[PDB]
Amino acid sequence: AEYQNIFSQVQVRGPADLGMTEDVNLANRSGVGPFSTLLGWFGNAQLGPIYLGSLGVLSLFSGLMWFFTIGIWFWFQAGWNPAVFLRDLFFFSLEPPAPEYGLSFAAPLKEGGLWLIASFFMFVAVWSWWGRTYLRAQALGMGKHTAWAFLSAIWLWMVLGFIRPILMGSWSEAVPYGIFSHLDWTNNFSLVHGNLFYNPFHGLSIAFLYGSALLFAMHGATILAVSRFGGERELEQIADRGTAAERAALFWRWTMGFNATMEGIHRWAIWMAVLVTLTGGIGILLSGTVVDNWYVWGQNHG
Amino acid sequence: DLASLAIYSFWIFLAGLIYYLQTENMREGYPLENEDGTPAANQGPFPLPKPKTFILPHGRGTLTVPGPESEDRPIALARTAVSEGFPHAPTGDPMKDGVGPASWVARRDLPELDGHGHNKIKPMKAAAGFHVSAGKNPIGLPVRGCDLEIAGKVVDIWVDIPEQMARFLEVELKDGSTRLLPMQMVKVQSNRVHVNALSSDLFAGIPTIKSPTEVTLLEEDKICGYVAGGLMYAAPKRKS
Amino acid sequence: ALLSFERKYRVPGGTLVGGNLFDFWVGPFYVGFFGVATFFFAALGIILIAWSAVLQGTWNPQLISVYPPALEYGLGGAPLAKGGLWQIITICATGAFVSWALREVEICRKLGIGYHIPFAFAFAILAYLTLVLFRPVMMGAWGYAFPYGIWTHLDWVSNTGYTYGNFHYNPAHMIAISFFFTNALALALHGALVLSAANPEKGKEMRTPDHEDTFFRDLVGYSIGTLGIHRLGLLLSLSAVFFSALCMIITGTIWFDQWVDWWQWWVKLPWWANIPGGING
Ligand code: BCL
Ligand code: BCL
Ligand code: BCL
Numbered sequence: 001a002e003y004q005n006i007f008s009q010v011q012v013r014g015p016a017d018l019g020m021t022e023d024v025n026l027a028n029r030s031g032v033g034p035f036s037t038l039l040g041w042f043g044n045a046q047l048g049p050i051y052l053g054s055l056g057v058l059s060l061f062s063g064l065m066w067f068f069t070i071g072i073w074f075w076f077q078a079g080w081n082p083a084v085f086l087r088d089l090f091f092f093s094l095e096p097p098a099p100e101y102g103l104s105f106a107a108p109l110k111e112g113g114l115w116l117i118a119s120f121f122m123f124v125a126v127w128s129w130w131g132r133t134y135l136r137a138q139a140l141g142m143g144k145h146t147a148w149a150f151l152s153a154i155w156l157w158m159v160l161g162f163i164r165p166i167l168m169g170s171w172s173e174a175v176p177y178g179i180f181s182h183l184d185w186t187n188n189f190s191l192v193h194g195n196l197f198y199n200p201f202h203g204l205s206i207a208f209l210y211g212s213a214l215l216f217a218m219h220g221a222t223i224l225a226v227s228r229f230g231g232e233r234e235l236e237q238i239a240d241r242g243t244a245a246e247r248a249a250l251f252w253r254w255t256m257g258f259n260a261t262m263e264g265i266h267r268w269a270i271w272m273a274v275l276v277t278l279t280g281g282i283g284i285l286l287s288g289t290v291v292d293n294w295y296v297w298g299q300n301h302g
Numbered sequence: 303d304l305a306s307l308a309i310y311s312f313w314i315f316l317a318g319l320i321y322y323l324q325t326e327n328m329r330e331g332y333p334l335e336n337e338d339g340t341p342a343a344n345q346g347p348f349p350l351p352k353p354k355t356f357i358l359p360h361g362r363g364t365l366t367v368p369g370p371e372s373e374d375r376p377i378a379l380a381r382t383a384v385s386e387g388f389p390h391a392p393t394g395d396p397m398k399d400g401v402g403p404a405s406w407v408a409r410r411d412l413p414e415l416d417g418h419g420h421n422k423i424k425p426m427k428a429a430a431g432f433h434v435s436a437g438k439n440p441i442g443l444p445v446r447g448c449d450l451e452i453a454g455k456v457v458d459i460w461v462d463i464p465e466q467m468a469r470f471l472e473v474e475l476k477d478g479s480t481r482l483l484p485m486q487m488v489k490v491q492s493n494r495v496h497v498n499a500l501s502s503d504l505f506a507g508i509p510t511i512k513s514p515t516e517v518t519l520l521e522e523d524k525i526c527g528y529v530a531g532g533l534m535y536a537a538p539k540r541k542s
Numbered sequence: 543a544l545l546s547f548e549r550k551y552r553v554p555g556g557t558l559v560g561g562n563l564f565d566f567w568v569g570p571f572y573v574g575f576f577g578v579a580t581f582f583f584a585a586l587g588i589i590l591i592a593w594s595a596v597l598q599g600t601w602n603p604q605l606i607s608v609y610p611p612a613l614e615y616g617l618g619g620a621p622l623a624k625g626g627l628w629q630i631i632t633i634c635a636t637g638a639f640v641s642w643a644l645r646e647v648e649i650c651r652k653l654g655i656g657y658h659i660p661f662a663f664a665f666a667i668l669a670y671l672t673l674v675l676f677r678p679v680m681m682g683a684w685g686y687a688f689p690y691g692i693w694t695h696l697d698w699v700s701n702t703g704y705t706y707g708n709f710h711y712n713p714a715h716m717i718a719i720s721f722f723f724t725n726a727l728a729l730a731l732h733g734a735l736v737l738s739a740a741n742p743e744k745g746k747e748m749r750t751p752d753h754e755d756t757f758f759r760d761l762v763g764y765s766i767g768t769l770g771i772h773r774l775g776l777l778l779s780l781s782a783v784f785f786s787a788l789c790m791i792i793t794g795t796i797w798f799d800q801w802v803d804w805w806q807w808w809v810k811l812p813w814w815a816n817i818p819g820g821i822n823g
């Protein structure tokens with residue numbers, strides 16, 4: 001048995017680290033929280049400090065209104081009875097406003113008005129948070145990569161419950177807030193469009209989804225296979241290539257005769273993943289608006 | 303129709319993306335070369351990208367890639383066949399000469415500095431507040447090689463300050479001097495530390511660092527390289 | 543044929559079989575005994591797939607499809623035309639996949655690095671044998687395996703799926719989808735992180751791992767770390783596939799009814815089973 005570097009053999013701890021200051025407003029940061037021996041077995045143990053600030057709160061708050069809004073409704077359903085509430089948690093659901101109401105914000109609560117309310121909260125909770133991720137990287141002088149790729153995630157989210165419903169002419173086309181409730185909508189959406197497996201974008205979406213798992217498995221295992229030379233210390237290998245970066249490239253060179261660099265691979269990474277919700281967002285925007293049946297479409301091609 | 307338009311657009315896009323992504327991963331190691339070190343004929347269909355310069359922090363200067371690729375070190379190897387494609391046998395001690403699994407890269411002979419300009423790594427006996435917070439403490443435990451014999455004993459733990467992580471075990475050998483072993487290369491057991499790669503009589507062969515309070519990117523590579531190659535080369539001792 | 547820094551690595555040794563026999567390269571490609579095996583099992587198969595194509599009277603790729611023996615043949619061999627070729631090609635595929643894995647082990651031994659890669663690969667190879675070997679054998683019929691065809695194998699997915707209603711209800715399939723989604727989240731993040739540190743705003747200094755750990759705490763309050771995210775990556779991945787191989791080994795062998803029905807156990811619990819109202823009652 002030889003150490004495989006999955007879990008540390010020895011944990012070490014020094015004074016709580018407050019992190020780089022740069023142009024961050026330490027006034028808005030918080031205080032360091034507890035250390036976690038459990039967490040420290042896989043990664044960092046230091047919990048906190050976290051930067052709250054304004055934008056953060058808008059989201060952190062807005063995000064509870066959306067959570068609670070649907071929560072109230074769930075109880076209205078379980079007849080304020082806990083036993084029930086707990087029993088049918090996955091079955092409850094805050095459906096969207098019936099087709100009759102259209103895109104109007106006039107549908108009553110028990111008829112899809114509550115859905116509108118909650119969603120609104122979510123729309124705030126996510127966007128404000130998005131601006132947060134762009135801001136916190138600026139304060140540190142970093143690129144806006146994290147913020148940009150998060151947009152791609154937002155993309156699919158925007159199409160599923162906003163862009164498309166609007167293009168369809170009804171707040172009904174949206175997705176219900178419910179565990180099993182939304183699983184059904186998903187299976188349902190497909191059957192109504194001629195089986196998405198025929199959607200060329202969907203099949204592409206899957207390609208990347210799987211690709212993301214293929215890539216991260218390779219990358220993670222590689223970086224672990226050469227950590228005996230300091231692999232995880234990626235940024236430095238980027239400014240000064242070491243054996244780690246080399247043996248790492250040669251392995252894939254001799255395996256599939258084609259390879260990457262310590263920085264390049266991350267470009268493959270961020271792109272591999274990002275394309276999952278970008279292509280997905282597309283395949284879905286076109287379904288129901290330009291294409292009605294993907295089987296029928298897979299035939300005439302338009 | 304729109305759908306069919308969008309789908310083709312995407313394939314053109316993806317192509318440009320695979321082009322971009324490929325030429326980006328050619329910033330190092332390229333242009334290919336023959337076994338003799340001269341530029342190979344065909345360099346593939348992809349062209350080296352325009353160069354890019356990094357601004358290393360702490361006034362360490364800059365880095366431009368792709369740039370002139372050099373090994374800036376001698377290679378003790380000799381061909382084993384007349385044709386291309388075969389192994390290059392070592393012409394001395396692969397471990398000493400540092401070839402094959404024992405290879406190392408000539409990196410800057412300075413240590414890595416944290417976001418503050420301080421040596422990212424330090425022997426724990428020089429690190430404030432730092433202590434073994436969990437797990438077994440190796441300090442004091444003896445060290446054994448793959449030949450079931452004792453090479454020396456751990457006298458301190460070198461840690462990463464900013465990422466609070468153990469990275470090396472400063473071991474004391476029979477003659478009083480110390481050597482760094484990669485944390486990722488030893489089994490800290492109940493009553494010892496086991497080193498599978500090397501075998502007792504080789505712990506002295508491990509490279510040594512100058513200052514006894516900081517390791518340089520270069521020295522890390524020779525220490526790490528040397529121990530890894532002990533996996534292949536030391537074998538003629540690794541009984542167990 | 544070599545990268546500026548490659549020669550010092552092309553030393554003798556590392557092979558598991560045959561010794562110095564196949565210990566040599568071919569362009570960037572390393573060979574090894576197992577480099578030969580994969581060629582063998584791959585040329586063999588491709589051929590079988592080519593022949594299997596003429597017997598189907600089609601050369602078109604979006605149509606060709608080697609089908610498995612019909613349920614009547616059970617777990618016995620079948621006529622090259624009635625699932626025979628399929629059965630053989632599966633052997634070639636399996637053997638090609640294994641030889642490839644072990645080839646990586648040798649590429650590993652030569653470079654003196656860990657065996658994490660060939661190990662993580664084995665999890666895929668595992669899922670594969672879960673579909674073409676374990677589930678079918680437990681169900682006693684090579685017919686429960688999937689077909690080899692671009693879209694024709696997609697049908698298999700869809701049919702096998704709707705055979706139990708919305709397959710969304712399979713509990714494990716439910717866990718596997720979560721790790722798959724998370725893995726993409728984690729990959730998207732890690733890449734944006736490292737890159738945003740090595741590629742800061744114009745004219746600025748290259749950040750450090752420190753600015754990385756900083757960035758996340760500010761954002762989410764915690765930061766797993768440079769070694770952790772690579773640990774998380776390998777884990778999220780292999781898990782997503784583990785649970786995927788799992789949700790299919792239980793389907794059709796220990797549970798063969800609608801998956802949405804399996805949630806009754808929950809809803810039909812003494813304490814609330816009859817408690818009037820809700821969604822169920
Ligand atoms: C996992 C559950 C189902 C399944 C469900 C689906 C679904 C659902 C979809 C696919 C799709 C795909 N599947 Mg599948 N698929 C299964 C099992 C397999 C097996 C196998 C050996 O068992 C293989 C090779 C494939 C391969 C493929 C790809 C052709 C295509 C996805 C692109 C991708 O990014 O893939 C991930 C891999 C990479 C990014 C790595 C690169 C590998 C390349 C792409 C392989 C090409 C192989 C070529 C087409 C076959 C060559 C055979 C010759 C003999 C050499 N599937 C099982 C049985 N598959 C998608 C599609 O669009 O299909 C038409 C899709 O929507
Ligand atoms: C029976 C049903 C249909 C079907 C119907 C659909 C439908 C309908 C859709 C998909 C979509 C997808 N399908 Mg499908 N799909 C089927 C079968 C398959 C099979 C298979 C092997 O059979 C596979 C591999 C897939 C795979 C996939 C994915 C590639 C893709 C979703 C990517 C993603 O990450 O989304 C998840 C990611 C997001 C939704 C991102 C947005 C997240 C937002 C920004 C975050 C909000 C956060 C909130 C405010 C915070 C909560 C946090 C708190 C801490 C709690 N499908 C069958 C045939 N599929 C989706 C797509 O895009 O398709 C093109 C989609 O709409
Ligand atoms: C892409 C096509 C479909 C779709 C198809 C599916 C399918 C198919 C499945 C899910 C599943 C899930 N989907 Mg979905 N889903 C869609 C859009 C969304 C949106 C959105 C804002 O648009 C959100 C927030 C979600 C959220 C979720 C999760 C609740 C759940 C997956 C776990 C996970 O790892 O998530 C990634 C996110 C994180 C790791 C971070 C946040 C996770 C939070 C903190 C925890 C949720 C816990 C859950 C409620 C706990 C139950 C515990 C009880 C003890 C049993 N979906 C679209 C419309 N979704 C899975 C499931 O198990 O469903 C029942 C599943 O199989």
Ligand code: BCL
Pocket residue numbers: 186187639666667668669670672673698699700701702703704708709710715718719722783785786787788789790
């Ligand atoms: C209508 C159909 C049903 C459904 C039916 C099924 C069925 C049926 C199955 C799945 C399976 C899966 N489903 Mg589903 N699924 C549905 C809806 C969804 C949705 C959604 C958002 O709606 C999602 C996210 C998913 C997600 C998933 C995945 C978790 C899982 C497949 C990945 C996998 O196993 O990889 C595992 C990876 C492999 C098997 C690949 C192995 C690769 C081998 C080793 C190498 C090949 C090399 C190649 C030949 C080499 C080429 C070389 C050349 C040089 C290029 N499903 C709907 C409701 N789903 C599958 C599963 O769990 O499978 C185990 C499965 O069987």
Ligand SMILES: CC[C@H]1c2cc3[nH]c4c(c3C)C(=O)[C@H](C(=O)OC)c4c3nc(cc4[nH]c(cc(n2)[C@@H]1C)c(C(C)=O)c4C)[C@@H](C)[C@@H]3CCC(=O)OC/C=C(\C)CCC[C@H](C)CCC[C@H](C)CCCC(C)C
Pocket residue numbers: 059060063064067125126127129133146147149150151152153273274275276277723724726727730731761762
């Ligand atoms: C290729 C695209 C992939 C992707 C990328 C992605 N996601 C991202 C990012 C990126 C690049 C971010 O930067 C952003 C992030 O911040 O990550 C850490 C994020 C993010 N992706 C998220 C989710 C998510 N991503 C998903 C998917 C994907 N993300 C894709 C796979 C999914 C799926 C699969 O469905 C989900 C659910 C969010 C967690 C996060 C953005 C956070 C956000 O929008 O927050 C608004 C705030 C709230 C909703 C707060 C309330 C939350 C709960 C409802 C209540 C309980 C919490 C409360 C704090 C408890 C307090 C308890 C007390 C006791 C203290």
Ligand SMILES: CC[C@H]1c2cc3[nH]c4c(c3C)C(=O)[C@H](C(=O)OC)c4c3nc(cc4[nH]c(cc(n2)[C@@H]1C)c(C(C)=O)c4C)[C@@H](C)[C@@H]3CCC(=O)OC/C=C(\C)CCC[C@H](C)CCC[C@H](C)CCCC(C)C
Pocket residue numbers: 210211213214217218221255256580583584585586587588591631634635638639642646659660662663664665666667689690691692695779780783
């Ligand atoms: C288990 C976790 C994840 C993972 C990991 C993973 N994959 C890996 C590795 C790892 C760690 C490798 O090291 C290895 C690699 O070298 O990658 C570059 C690989 C790899 N993952 C691959 C594919 C792959 N991985 C997938 C998934 C995953 N891989 C998971 C998400 C998928 C999916 C989900 O679709 C696919 C297609 C290969 C490209 C590659 C290994 C290549 C290899 O073994 O090559 C030699 C093989 C041949 C010559 C095979 C021919 C065999 C037969 C003669 C004919 C074909 C028969 C086959 C049944 C036909 C199928 C047709 C379809 C239309 C249905």
Ligand SMILES: COC(C)(C)C/C=C/C(C)=C/C=C/C(C)=C/C=C/C(C)=C\C=C\C=C(C)\C=C\C=C(/C)CC/C=C(\C)CCC=C(C)C
Pocket residue numbers: 067068070071072074115116119120122123157158159160161162163175176177178179182
């Ligand atoms: C224990 O009890 C308490 C009280 C603590 C509460 C507990 C809470 C519970 C039990 C919450 C349960 C909620 C769940 C499980 C929610 C699940 C949601 C899921 C699975 C998916 C969500 C899909 C939604 C997407 C598609 C939504 C997209 C929304 C938008 C793009 C914005 C929509 C915009 C609208 C309607 C317009 C508003 C107006 C403007 C300004 C444009």
Ligand SMILES: [Fe+3]
Pocket residue numbers: 219223234266732736772
């Ligand atoms: Fe990385």
